[PDB]
Amino acid sequence: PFQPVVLLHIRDVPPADQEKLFIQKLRQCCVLFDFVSDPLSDLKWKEVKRAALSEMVEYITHNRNVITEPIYPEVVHMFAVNMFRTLPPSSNPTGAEFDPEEDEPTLEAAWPHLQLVYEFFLRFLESPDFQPNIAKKYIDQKFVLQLLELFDSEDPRERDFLKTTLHRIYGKFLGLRAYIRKQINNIFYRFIYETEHHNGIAELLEILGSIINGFALPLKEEHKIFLLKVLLPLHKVKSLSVYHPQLAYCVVQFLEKDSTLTEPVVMALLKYWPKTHSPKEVMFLNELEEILDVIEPSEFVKIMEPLFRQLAKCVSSPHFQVAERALYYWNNEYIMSLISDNAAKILPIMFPSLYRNSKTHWNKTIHGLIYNALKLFMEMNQKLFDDCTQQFKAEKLKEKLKMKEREEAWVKIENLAKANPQYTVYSQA
């Protein structure tokens, strides 16, 4: 807490001492004041700081050479000290134990001042007079890592400002792109394997989506492995609904860049298929449909058999939302074209599941959709539908013999025909 000195208007003074008044102002606003213990105290000091900040954000892009070599460190320093102050603990959120929407986000106690500072820093980077080569000497990896660490705050607004300034830094500074990507790999690995709690995942996924949209070059191995071991493992987290759209956008972007990466993504999604959670099953079906829309017929054929097997499994679910979303796949004309192409393999899998749940569900809409799908199958092909029907009735009687033979034989060979009459002495308990 320091008493500010009497200062004049920047536009009134000649441009000769405009930068001297500017760096003195950058030093005056460098001082911080309490906002959580006694916000009543130092009101004069607070309003003076706010008036100074308001003049600065205006001064930017409203004068010649507002930002120059001697100004670059002072601007970075004032932004750094205020922003890099240690974040308080999530006392009331209890570490965001409650849902992020249900939990009240901790809005910055000094948001107005912070908002102004974030606005000023963005105006600084965007300004034409800003030079990345001059600033690269001063903005270093420590600045980037501190900014990335700051992404854990609650206020959505400051998170948006962080995302915007990170995008600006990534675009302007070419030399730090690899380091930024590496640090984003780490902030994602740590969240997925160690913490399992975070608030800035959506913004980081948005930043990644712009980087993928800017992957004009053919994907390098680093990008491929990063997609296969960062984005796909992110579906394991229980908070998928928070950042689902961003992850969906990112997955589609990577497949648009390279369709050869389609088969593995599909296997990873099927492996990470949720069994207990329904909302997660819903978003998984949404992701599948979005991907299914852009798949080249060739890549689709490679994984049609397990994808539709999982689809037939999910239809059987008594959940009405899961059932309706799976049955809505018949609306997309492309999926209809894909099945008309591959009916000979596709029908024998979907058909028994659809028949089994034909009358089991309680909801009327589910039954209506199932009958619609049933009529569509016999309409597209009558002979194939009849063949699937006779195979289904044959299986309905053969399942008894199968269950009788498979269960008895497995148990017998498992231990009855081995543990008991082989190496009895070595066998224990």
Add this chain to the structure above:
Amino acid sequence: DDSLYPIAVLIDELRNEDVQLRLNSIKKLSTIALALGVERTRSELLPFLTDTIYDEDEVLLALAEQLGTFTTLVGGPEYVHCLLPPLESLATVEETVVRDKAVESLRAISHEHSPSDLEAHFVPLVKRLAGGDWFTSRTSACGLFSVCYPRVSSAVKAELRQYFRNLCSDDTPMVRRAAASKLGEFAKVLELDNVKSEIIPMFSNLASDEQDSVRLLAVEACVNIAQLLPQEDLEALVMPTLRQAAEDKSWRVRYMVADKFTELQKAVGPEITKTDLVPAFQNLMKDCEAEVRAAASHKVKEFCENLSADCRENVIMSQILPCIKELVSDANQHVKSALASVIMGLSPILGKDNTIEHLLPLFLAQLKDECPEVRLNIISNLDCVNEVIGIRQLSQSLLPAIVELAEDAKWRVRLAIIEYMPLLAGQLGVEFFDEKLNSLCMAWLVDHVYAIREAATSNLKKLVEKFGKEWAHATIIPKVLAMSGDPNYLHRMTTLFCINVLSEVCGQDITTKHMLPTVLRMAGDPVANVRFNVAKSLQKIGPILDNSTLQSEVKPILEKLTQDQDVDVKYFAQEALTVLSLA
């Protein structure tokens, strides 16, 4: 073949679409392996386990456990090294739980290994795992450095130390966190001369690291190094590190330091503790963060207790008490809550004169505090202070507060004071309880919270077991018999509860003479709940009562109750009759 048939059934299970069957097969693999025998088990384990790796991580977890306990299947140390290759691939996998299950199994089986096999096979395996190009392998290898160290040779020991240093110097933070966590164990295994030579440089780099998590892990691990190092060396070895950790800008590091403050004080040494930890504790107690203040308040007692009694009290009165006083009126719930529970145990530590002079006014403030959490803690721990201060002085100081808190709105507060009442009843005497503490017990009994009523009944039993049966007969029985007239059936149940509870100590004679007719009269109540509870009390007092009264008065009434329309009442009357075997 004999080896082929179990391998085939497992393949069939792996190819099965149902994952549940595969999980049941891998969970029941132990017996299948018992059948194979030493000759076929090992030939099956290498190729099959590599195949099993390509399955659900849940399946991988199942074999992880199985392998961790399959020392019997391998002939012994001679064939244990065959289990290393599968475990290695199970440890280097992506998923965390299976990796943890694997490394811990590896640590468990590392002991059974022979030193020659350790150097021949285990050391190359750990070298490869530490040299892996992925962070999971490095994190797994972090956990095997300690176990294999004591039996390898000096050159192998130096190589392991160099690999551990390289792992600590890793650029990836996840690897650094695993190394920082295992630093304490590695130092414990390491020799003191080698610790001073290598552990201190690796530790300082981590303490001075920019990342906060590796910093807090380092300050947590510093306890083991402080234990091993001589006290004379700790002044110039870890004291700069402790000062930097205490003065660190990250509040998480300060919180971790505060949480383990007692351990650091114990390890460093009491004399060095007062000289270098008292200003630090005072600064940590007066910190701008709530969590560090809360952690500090928790250790306030332990730190005072472990002080050298030579000047302990002087230290407290001169440095601690001013901080506590400042902290008492702190504008935060958590710090006041933690301090209130911890502060009571400071009474005996402070000289007896100091308590009355300083602790009692702080206690009265914590008692009068609006915060519900602080007062409840004080009353729960109020038991200890009775010994330090003479009862006559103690009662005068706290009874004003006790009689105000007895009618506190929160039931939990009232529940605690009821539990503590027996102690004051015994200490003060029967005359004191009758003169001022009896009305409190009555109002407690007639309270509308059922938990309060049960606590009051238990309290009644606790005071009557020591105050004499005749005293309650001539003083409590007439008072409690009046409550039966209350219009609410719920308050009538309270009368029944206390009649049931005090019958045991009053004995058959008194029960028949005064309260048995009251229960008999109450039995004719219209509410079915009253009839249901009368039957319960009659069953309980039936053994206490004489057989002649049972047959003469209890039997006919129970017979009438069995004829009652309410299935609930009839059933319980029948149960009471069967229990007493009157019919």
Add this chain to the structure above:
Amino acid sequence: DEKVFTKELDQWIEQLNECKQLSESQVKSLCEKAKEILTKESNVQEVRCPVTVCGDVHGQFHDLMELFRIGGKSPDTNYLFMGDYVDRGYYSVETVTLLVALKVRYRERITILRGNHESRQITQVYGFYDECLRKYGNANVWKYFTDLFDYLPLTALVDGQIFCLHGGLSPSIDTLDHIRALDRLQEVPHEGPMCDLLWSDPDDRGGWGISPRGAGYTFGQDISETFNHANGLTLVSRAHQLVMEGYNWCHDRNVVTIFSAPNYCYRCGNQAAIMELDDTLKYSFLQFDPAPRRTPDYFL
């Protein structure tokens, strides 16, 4: 009262008191017996005078135990649970199983009323189905409870004067006879009298207003007073709407709302309230506070 069945129920209740879930076969048997017992009830159930009316628990087990301490135990005090307790709350399965096992024992002492969350679609959309599937690995328990919910009674009458109903009045229903002739054993309609019955709330605007949610229809003070005068009801109690105090006088003492779920959504900080009815049929309130609270999805 089979001796084996009574001791089995006592054990099941005791196990539940330690926050331990029952086995699937035992749960199904208990649900079957509860359904058999409840099939003999009517749309309205006669209730004795001394009863402790309780608001919607919301399946939060810990606060439910606190309630059982503040009031008497179920065998000791008659309980009227008339609210949602099958979703939007952790350990919901434990809460609903304890309530049902308490209903089958001492059926006369305790009575439970169907709420708006008992609907199959509503139970599933609000986080019950997934949790039950997590705690049991199958949907059989979920289907058994949805059937039990379909067989729950809708509303009950206390001593012929106090009319206790979850939700609010419906334009179609004009007397208790309309509720009686109606069929309680059905899945809740998307739009219909039962839909308005379990979703309506009082409002100050007056007249048959519309609730912000499509399912309910807000009722004015005049309609409530007219229904009370026609049906001879001194007071109507409801639990659907959330109240911070846990109790309020909605229409000048014509209607009262009781909420027995404290610290709702772990952010409201509300204090729960319980209604007390003595032999004189007078009403009292007592307040309490929440008790100190004490694998990947793909993985099997």
